[PDB]
Write a protein that binds this DNA or RNA. Structure first.
Lengths: 100, 103, 232, 178, 117, 129, 91
RNA sequence: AGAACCUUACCUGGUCUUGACAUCCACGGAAGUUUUCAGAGAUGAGAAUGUGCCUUCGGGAACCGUGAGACAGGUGCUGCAUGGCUGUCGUCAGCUCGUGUUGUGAAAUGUUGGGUUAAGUCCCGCAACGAGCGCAACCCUUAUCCUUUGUUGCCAGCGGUCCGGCCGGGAACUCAAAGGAGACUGCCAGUGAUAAACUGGAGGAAGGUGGGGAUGACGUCAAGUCAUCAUGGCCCUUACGACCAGGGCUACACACGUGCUACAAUGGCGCAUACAAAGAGAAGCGACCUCGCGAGAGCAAGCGGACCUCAUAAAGUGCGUCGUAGUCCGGAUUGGAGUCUGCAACUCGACUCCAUGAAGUCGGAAUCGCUAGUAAUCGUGGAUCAGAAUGCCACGGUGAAUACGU
């Protein structure tokens, strides 16, 4: 359900590439432990203001083929409902029902 | 501790699919080389999924799905790469991938 | 109207499926979406003829499509250009060098989805749906299969209210877990709204599908019964 | 209910014993699932009884396990008329397990410095017919020995039975005619 | 011997015995026992009072509760003139740091009261 | 068995491999002493417990390998692996020890958890209104 | 209780807005949406007006307020008390 | 099933309408990458690298901004307008499909009785006859045991040797995954109406349709989802779309469902001491490395997981200890420090650790699951998975009472 979160995610991967690539460990290099006596100063602590949407921490995905409100499953690119649906029709390979 | 001469892995999604695909690789390995190792079974892998049986509600029964991932050794006593090129090429049955390497 | 989960919880335990490929780890998702896409786009291209089963397969270094039809050579075209085009798009979607072979299923001239086409027409045109499901089952049992179940739903006959109805015949077990057996869910709309048929068809309880392998893979085809094993 | 009679299963032995009366004593002494402690709890108790008297290690154990132990039980049944009871004779297996259960509940709250002292003293106390479950054995057997004078819905059952072939006496029944 | 706290035993090992004698838990009690040369394997009830006096003396340097709980008084008092909301919840005892409060709550958030289910 | 008579002793998913011969009475476990592998454990008094019965703590010699399970289950397994192996005085020895209970294996097998529950078989409770 | 990632920073987003204002000695409400921010020496003496998701609430920034992220001083949410109901009549 | 914003419905604030996305026309910037800065971020300006792709170099695709239609999009309403899909009775022990018959018929009969059962299974028998469904079966798995492979598995004797399969070497052996064998309520005895079959009996790894799992009929219930998804009638399309930030479900008054771990001592503590199974890791985890109170940190050989790592697995075991005293159980709160994905952890997130220290004595009405690898209880991994678990899911440690009776 609901296209706006699916719309957000599709824009995001080109915006990951554009903002975040040049500014991945830059947080760490300029501020944190990699800034060992170098940087840590104001004249360099203005450089990362473009990436905020681009960040992997907002790259939630959900169901990669329709969208779904939570309950995503990363190994299929699918969800609870949509896995069962694809299995009924035999579209998924290697698929047992558990018995041992 | 007797070691191997070459390193080979056969990878498949169910129990019929590994036995047929292996039995065919072991056949190619005799048909293009003299010196052959029969396959060791190795600990097969099993992935656990739980999903709901229905679109909404209930808790009493739900659903559990399994996918097994099957590993065969094969290998060859001779370390001859030409046999491994042929091995991985002529394996186009039951949708198994064999992964090659040297050492 | 409990509707037990009619095939999903029954597979891979000597019951073949409409995909056979190997993946694991985190890339299983990238291979499955790609497999959905090739299933959706490829059967649309060979839609010129009716089609009875679809099998897409990924062994070492190749992608192999098996397709099953009511007559062979029919989706393969004339010359060979038609089938090189089918292999162009299978490679394009999966991203691996492509193969296709033509093959037919057991009882080819009958299939789950061609019964539901037959039942749908009467309903699409808003006339003669009160004996149509029964004549569909009769024809269906004259062309093959050891038993058939049909369930029809819709705003049926063009009615201003909903109806469930069904028709069952012969031997169609429902806890069965051995041999492939053929299933289709139709969905379609016409002027008054949506109709649908759930068509289960049952060929055989050991006829059709794979069989259980009758050996270990461990003794067979082995020209040298050792590497060393301490015996040299 | 029940389509068939179903008996007890096989129970496995424990790494310190091959005797049954010992293995069944450690078993219902089991809590948290961990028998491998209970092995010791039985053998540390039995040595303390054995210091109290040296003729046996079993002195207080064997008669406590007789004395706090029932013989009969009463169920309550009524679907019409008036309230009645039906006594039943039960199996040795459950007579024994009520008795051992009651010994291990009573001894663990007895509050002495070792579980070994607590059990040897609570078997020593019930052996002499003055412990904590002597009262429980005496009340429960009194009620089952007494309600043998009653039967499920007696007043209609006394006409109903003699019409459908049966006796003219007064007898207990398992929720049916008499 | 017991004298102080909620987990000091009588006739059990030394490791535990310093851990509610105020200002010292397990980590320091390991270093203290070593420093006097005392084993991490004697029961404290077996000692002279003057080995307990040597141990106690090495506890007594670290912050006792009397001064800890004054730091927590001044902590709430500083925070409430800010209105730092985390701090307003810390005062009342409201599980705020990463927790739910709709739970079985009575000891912190108040007893049973007349409200609908 | 073409060097030593052999017992398998698999109990509770642990297996005691036990190779028996005549000897000076000793035990070797895991290419070591009972003190190395089972140092400071009740498990050592268990593994002598079948050898005391057949009066073979001093004249049966033994070589022992054990993997799987946990501390009690290996002790239990070696108790079955010795009595299994003991065939080489009489062909009825292993028959009779089984009759006495030492080859007798418990009635427990593998079982898989089921879904829709909180445990192997243990459905959720209901108390709703 | 919670340290603010492993090494030192300042918060880059609040720095460019504040730095130019602390030079002017401004104490006027600074229109801020960027609430994922910390308090630092450069930030004392300012008044940072903090969007809550309905409107900005002014937080007077001072020397006593170090050890905190912005937004907690001004309402994060309302409470639940001990006596209320919606249910009533009015005609 | 992993909810800071995102998520995501909700709410408020910026900002635009072909629009995050496809094709089709028009304009500015190549996208990609490196890099300073303003503003909240959207977005933009400047620097430096590149001007690729196809071609009428008309012009456009790619990403991004701009604009127009056709058109895209819609957790848009209506679940007596619907499709797909599923929960219930219940493992009820019955239901249905074709057809005859008895009654004027509605409809029964079968599909109901007795005895027996997972069973429409089986003895007896009436109008039910023939057949399917539930159930039985094929099925995967275990159990010994046969059987083959012989590493990334193993080691009785033998070598290098600290006595570790690490390696010369060996195949007795588990051992992994698979052909399967064996066990059929078949036998004997009791029970049972002769009888199905239940129980007992025995050898054996193992007997109750061997142990486990798969496994659930027609279908009323106007049952629940238009919110995976399909979809008409039918509404917006400068929006019931869409880009960006922040706030909230997870508040706290309590009640309520479920589960977790405690209240003990079958346990905790101190010291000393032991053995797993299984599985996850191609933007990832990961030996060594230097740093770290610990968790972790950045670097990296390595990896494809029977090879490398999570991992010291814990409870349990050895000894001593403890007396109902909130303790020798429990350790919440809180001060205060250290960490993770990311500009950014404050309220809404997770983990480590230092000091102090409360609630809780097995909980009332109510109430369920369970027949044995179960139940109970302790750790483990995994699905999920940006970041993290008390749960779930599956595993392995230690592993129970009883099943008369309705």
């Amino acid at each position: 359900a609901k296209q706006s979160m699916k719309a957000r995610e599709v824009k995001r991967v080109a915006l990951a590439d554009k903002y975040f690539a040049k500014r991945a460990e830059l947080k760490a290099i300029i501020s944190d432990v990699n800034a060992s006596d170098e940087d840590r100063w104001n004249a360099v602590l203005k450089l990362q203001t473009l990436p905020r949407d681009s960040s992997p921490s907002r790259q939630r995905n959900r169901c990669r083929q329709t969208g779904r409100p939570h309950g995503f499953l990363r190994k299929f690119g699918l969800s609870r409902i949509k896995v069962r649906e694809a299995a009924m029709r035999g579209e998924i390979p290697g698929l047992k029902k558990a018995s041992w | 501790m007797q070691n191997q001469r070459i390193r080979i892995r056969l990878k498949a999604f169910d129990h019929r699919l590994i036995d047929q695909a292996t039995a065919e690789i072991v056949e190619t390995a005799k048909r293009t080389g003299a010196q052959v190792r029969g396959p060791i079974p190795l600990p097969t892998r099993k992935e656990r999924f739980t999903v709901l049986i229905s679109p909404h509600v209930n808790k009493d029964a739900r659903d559990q799905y399994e996918i097994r991932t099957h590993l065969r050794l094969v290998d060859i006593v001779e370390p001859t790469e030409k046999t491994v090129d042929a091995l991985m090429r002529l394996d186009l049955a039951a949708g198994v991938d064999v992964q090659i390497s040297l050492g | 109207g409990q509707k037990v989960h009619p095939n999903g919880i029954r597979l891979g335990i000597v019951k073949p499926w409409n995909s056979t490929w190997f993946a694991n780890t985190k890339e299983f998702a990238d291979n499955l979406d790609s497999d959905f896409k090739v299933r959706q786009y490829l059967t649309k291209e060979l839609a010129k003829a009716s089609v009875s089963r679809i099998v897409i397969e990924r062994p070492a270094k190749s992608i192999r499509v098996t397709i099953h039809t009511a007559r062979p050579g029919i989706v393969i075209g004339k010359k060979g250009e038609d089938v090189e085009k089918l292999r162009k798009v299978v490679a394009d979607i999966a991203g691996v060098p492509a193969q296709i072979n033509i093959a037919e299923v057991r009882k080819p001239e009958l299939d789950a989805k061609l019964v539901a086409d037959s039942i749908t027409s009467q309903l699409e045109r808003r006339v003669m749906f009160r004996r149509a499901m029964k004549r569909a089952v009769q024809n269906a049992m004259r062309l093959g299969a050891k038993g058939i179940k049909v369930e029809v739903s819709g705003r049926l006959g063009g009615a201003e209210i909903a109806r469930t109805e069904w028709y069952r015949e012969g031997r169609v077990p429902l806890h069965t877990l051995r041999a492939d057996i053929d299933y289709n869910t139709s969905e379609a709309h016409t002027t008054y709204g949506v109709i649908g048929v759930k068509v289960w068809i049952f060929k055989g309880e050991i006829l059709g599908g794979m069989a259980a392998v009758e050996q270990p893979e461990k003794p067979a085809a082995q020209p040298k019964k050792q590497q060393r094993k301490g015996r040299k | 209910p029940r389509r068939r009679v179903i008996g007890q299963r096989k129970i496995l032995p424990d790494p310190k014993f091959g005797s049954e009366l010992l293995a069944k004593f450690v078993n219902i002494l089991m809590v948290d699932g961990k028998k491998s402690t209970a092995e010791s709890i039985v053998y540390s108790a039995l040595e303390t009884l054995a210091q109290r008297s040296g003729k046996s290690e079993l002195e207080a154990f064997e008669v406590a396990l007789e004395n706090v132990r029932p013989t009969v039980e009463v169920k309550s049944r009524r679907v019409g008329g008036s309230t009645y009871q039906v006594p039943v004779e039960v199996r040795p297996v459950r007579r024994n397990a009520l008795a051992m259960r009651w010994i291990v509940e009573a001894a663990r709250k007895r509050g002495d410095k070792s579980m070994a002292l607590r059990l040897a003293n609570e078997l020593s106390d019930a052996a002499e017919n003055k412990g904590t479950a002597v009262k429980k054995r005496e009340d429960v057997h009194r009620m089952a020995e007494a309600n043998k004078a009653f039967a499920h819905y007696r007043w209609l059952s006394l006409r109903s039975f003699s019409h459908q072939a049966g006796a003219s006496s007064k007898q207990p029944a398992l929720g049916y005619l008499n | 011997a017991r004298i102080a706290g909620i987990n000091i035993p009588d006739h059990k090992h030394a490791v535990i015995a310093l851990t509610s004698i105020y200002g010292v838990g397990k980590t320091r009690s390991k270093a203290i026992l070593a420093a006097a040369g005392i084993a991490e394997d004697v029961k404290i009830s077996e000692l002279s009072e003057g080995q307990i006096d040597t141990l106690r003396d090495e506890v007594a340097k670290f912050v006792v509760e009397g001064d800890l709980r004054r730091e927590i008084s001044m902590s709430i008092k500083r925070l409430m003139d800010l209105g730092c909301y985390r701090g307003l919840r810390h005062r009342r005892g409201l599980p705020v740091r990463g927790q739910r409060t709709k739970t079985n709550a009575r000891t912190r958030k108040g007893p049973r009261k007349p409200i609908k289910k | 068995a073409e060097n030593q008579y052999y017992g398998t002793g698999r109990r509770k998913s642990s297996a005691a491999r036990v190779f028996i011969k005549p000897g000076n009475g000793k035990i070797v476990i895991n290419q070591r002493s009972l003190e190395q592998y089972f140092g400071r454990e009740t498990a050592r008094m268990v593994v002598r417990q079948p050898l005391e019965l057949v009066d073979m703590v001093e004249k049966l010699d033994l070589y022992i390998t054990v993997k799987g399970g946990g501390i009690s289950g290996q002790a239990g397994a070696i108790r079955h692996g010795i009595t299994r192996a003991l065939m080489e005085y009489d062909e009825s020895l292993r028959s009779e020890l089984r009759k006495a209970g030492f080859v007798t294996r418990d009635a427990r097998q593998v079982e898989r958890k089921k879904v829709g529950l909180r445990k192997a078989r243990r459905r959720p409770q209901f108390s709703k209104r | 209780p919670r340290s603010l990632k492993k090494g030192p920073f300042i918060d880059l987003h609040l720095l460019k807005k504040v730095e130019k204002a602390v030079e002017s000695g401004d104490k006027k409400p600074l229109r801020t949406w960027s609430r994922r921010s910390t308090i630092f020496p450069n930030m004392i003496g300012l008044t940072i007006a903090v969007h809550n998701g309905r409107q900005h609430v002014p937080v007077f920034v001072t020397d006593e307020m170090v050890g905190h992220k912005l937004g907690e001083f001004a309402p994060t949410r309302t409470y639940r008390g001990h006596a209320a109901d919606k249910k009533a009549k009015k005609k």
